[PDB]
Amino acid sequence: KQSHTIGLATTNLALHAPSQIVAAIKSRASQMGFNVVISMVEQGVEACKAAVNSLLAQRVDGLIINVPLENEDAQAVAQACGNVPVLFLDVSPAPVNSVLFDPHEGARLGVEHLVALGHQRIALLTGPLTSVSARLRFEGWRQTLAQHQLQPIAVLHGDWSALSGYQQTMQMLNEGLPTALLVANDQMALGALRALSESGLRVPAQVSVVGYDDTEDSACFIPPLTTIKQDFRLLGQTSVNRLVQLLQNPSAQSPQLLPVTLVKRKTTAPPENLYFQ
């Protein structure tokens, strides 16, 4: 019997993007007459499978999985859900149902923006390489730079937090001087802005910075952050609608893509003294 309850397994809610995704899923679910029951998990098939079985024991109608998973591990989670519809929001190419922001396009937009402004010395601050999302953003950056015959001047790895963005940017400035930094999320970009400011490098006159997500606070960073927007409202609307559609007509697995956009604010400019005035 249907219960009008959707189960949501989610990675660390202390990161801003997953919490905005929960909020957007709850909002659409409420408009569609569904309650949402949320389980927060750590990495691993076992942690995800345990979350699924408990929800299925309490008769949830369908599941949404927002946890970073590689191909094989995503297949194992999908398998555990039995015949309950299940959707994934953070997976590599996998034979599973997914609703994804285009992982390569966000990286491409960031490189193209900086290259068009004239930058040639671009550093990359990735997320944790255990994350499929962080890996695909890194690969997209490297590939798009190579299409312009550029190599990144530095590549460092953070953990999605602001403090890691600060620490990795400080380390980057010990080894070289980029004119622009691509950062894999907005929280790390906040820490990079702090490191640049406290090192006497003005943003964007001396160093440009691009974030990723457009989480809510970023329009109020100093300076307001230029970033790749992932519209979490639309993700929440789309996933809840795809789950309702999967309850009515059980269908083959499909990967579905949502657009990303570059939001131009106040952290990018041409490289220092290209247009000295």
Ligand X SMILES: CO[C@@H]1O[C@H](CO)[C@H](O)[C@H](O)[C@H]1O
Residue 226 sits in the site that holds ligand X (CB under 6 A): no
Q: Which does 194 bind (CB under 5 to 8 A by kind): a second copy, ligand X, none?
A: a second copy
Give the orientation angle of helix 186-198 with respect to helix 162-175, to 10 degrees: 50
Taking the complex as a whole, how short is the minimal distance between the CB of residue 1 and ligand X, in angstroms? 34
Nearest in space to 225 (alpha carbons), one of 176, 251, 188, 172: 188
The region of 71-79, 81-89, 171-179, 186-194 touching a second copy under the rule CB under 8 A is 186-194
Give bridge partners of residue 82 from the DSSP assignment.
none
The region of 12-20, 57-65, 112-120, 264-272 touching ligand X under the rule CB under 6 A is 12-20
In terms of CB distance, is 201 or 221 closer to ligand X? Answer: 221
Query: What gap in Å lies between CA 186 and CA 15, rounded to an integer?
Result: 10
Taking the complex as a whole, how short is the minimal distance between the CB of residue 192 and a second copy, in angstroms? 9
Give bridge partners of residue 37 from the DSSP assignment.
7
In terms of CB distance, is 15 or 153 closer to ligand X? Answer: 15
Footprint of a second copy on 102-141 (CB under 8 A):
none
Footprint of ligand X on 154-173 (CB under 6 A):
160
Q: Which does 212 bind (CB under 5 to 8 A by kind): ligand X, a second copy, none?
A: ligand X
Alpha carbon 156 to its chain centroid, in Å, reads 17
Nearest in space to 154 (alpha carbons), one of 145, 226, 162, 163: 145
Instruction: Supply the Cα-derived Rg of the chain in whole angstroms.
Output: 20
Alpha helices in the chain (DSSP H): 16-31, 45-57, 71-80, 103-117, 132-147, 162-175, 186-198, 232-248
Taking the complex as a whole, how short is the minimal distance between the CB of residue 236 and ligand X, in angstroms? 12
Q: State the residue for tokens 């999967």.
A: 246
Strand duo 261-263 + 226-229: pairing: antiparallel
Q: Which does 36 bind (CB under 5 to 8 A by kind): ligand X, a second copy, none?
A: a second copy
Residue 160 sits in the site that holds a second copy (CB under 8 A): no
Instruction: Name which position in 169, 185, 267, 268 contacts ligand X (CB under 6 A).
Output: 185
Residue 217 sits in the site that holds a second copy (CB under 8 A): yes
Q: Secondary structure of 23-40 in the HEC alphabet?
A: HHHHHHHHHCCCEEEEEE
Taking the complex as a whole, how short is the minimal distance between the CB of residue 131 and ligand X, in angstroms? 6
H-helix or E-strand containing 202?
Answer: none
**Which residues contact a second copy by CB under 8 A?**
3, 5, 12-14, 16, 19-20, 22-23, 26, 35-40, 50, 54, 57-59, 161-163, 165-166, 187, 190-191, 193-194, 197, 216-217, 219-222, 224
Residues in the site for ligand X, rule: CB under 6 A?
A: 11, 15, 17-18, 68, 131, 133, 160, 185, 212-213
